[PDB]
């Protein structure tokens, strides 16, 4: 199984807010699709799908504030 972690979307980003999940449990994910909107102190970044598969679980739900880097947000299976 694949685990999607929160990356640095800004050079000095320590943490982000999961503003909104733009994908649902069961939905297909193509490489480049909008997975979620991550809000930082500096911008709100559209976080894109980089590995193809299917969304099985959301670990960090919508509205969750101040989540550090490398935090597992969701699990995807091919």
């Amino acid at each position: 199984h694949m685990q999607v972690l929160l990356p640095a979307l800004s050079p000095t980003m320590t943490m982000g807010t999961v503003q909104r999940w733009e994908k649902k449990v069961g939905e297909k994910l193509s490489e480049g699709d909008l997975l979620a909107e991550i809000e930082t102190d500096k911008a709100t970044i559209g976080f894109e799908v980089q590995e193809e598969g299917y969304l099985a679980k959301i670990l960090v739900p919508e509205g969750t504030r101040d989540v550090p880097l490398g935090t597992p947000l969701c699990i995807i299976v091919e």
Partner: protein
Amino acid sequence: SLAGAPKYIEHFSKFSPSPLSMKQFLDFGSSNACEKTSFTFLRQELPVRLANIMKEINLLPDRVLSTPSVQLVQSWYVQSLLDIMEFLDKDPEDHRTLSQFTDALVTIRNRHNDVVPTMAQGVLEYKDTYGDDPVSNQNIQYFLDRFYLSRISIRMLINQHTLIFDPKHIGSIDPNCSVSDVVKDAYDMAKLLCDKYYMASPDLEIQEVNATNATQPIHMVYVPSHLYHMLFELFKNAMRATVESHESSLTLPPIKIMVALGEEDLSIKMSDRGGGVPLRKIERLFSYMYSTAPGYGLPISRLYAKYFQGDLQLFSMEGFGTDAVIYLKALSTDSVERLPVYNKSAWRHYQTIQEAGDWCVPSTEPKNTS
């Protein structure tokens, strides 16, 4: 069939609609009233236009499609298509089938009479149930511009045939339409509604600048009811804005009209001092989703302008007032039907998905720089 309807839609949707010019409408009624060629044109073209738009109807969000009002409209379209297809193998030169064809057009126009408010109630039924998602809203906007323009085009064809084959007009077309007379009529009717709903109304000022001939009143080949529709809608908005932003009945600024005629464009600017609106809100005025409480006059007036290759543009100055400009083609050869085609290109527009966005969005809680 009734059973074979989706085959008939598939067959006719593969064809392109045939966009006609104002000149072609004029040349058809420049001398002889030929019912035969019109019948043979329309018994094919109307199915083509109906089928093209019906393919797009069943491509919209199912949550919009399953709505009672959209279901009803689609049933009107199925019936109308079927009604016309009954003339497909009928013989011209037989004067009874021509007379029956005209009867079939007036019947179709009568059942389609409320297509605009019904389609709008359909969007409304969708609104008060599902709310809004960016993707579905995007498709509804794209669809409605096309649906309503298709509608204007079909009603135009039917109006042309029935007015000629059932005034100096050539159908609904005035060869010498006085722009200012239409402006005066639209104003008078709006003034009347305003002076009864507020008990106060702005005055009208008209100026003309005819660059092609400095001393000739500006005239054009146009469908006066189309022009009247646009101006009537704009006048009401400009009167509402002017009345609601002012405190005195004695000193309220007139609405100013400028009609300009050049080599290519006929432009009508309406200026009000109704206090204006922020630019943020302007783009919202032509969206169908936002203009349904919790008002399709503006986006529909724009479609009327666009139908013969014109446009309708708003530019406001918040705190001051708004200019509204109708752009029309000055020449009947350039005034051509703006018709949607269903193809793979149109199909692609309904296959859109939520995407990141290629421009940066700021944080709603931007960093304190101290």
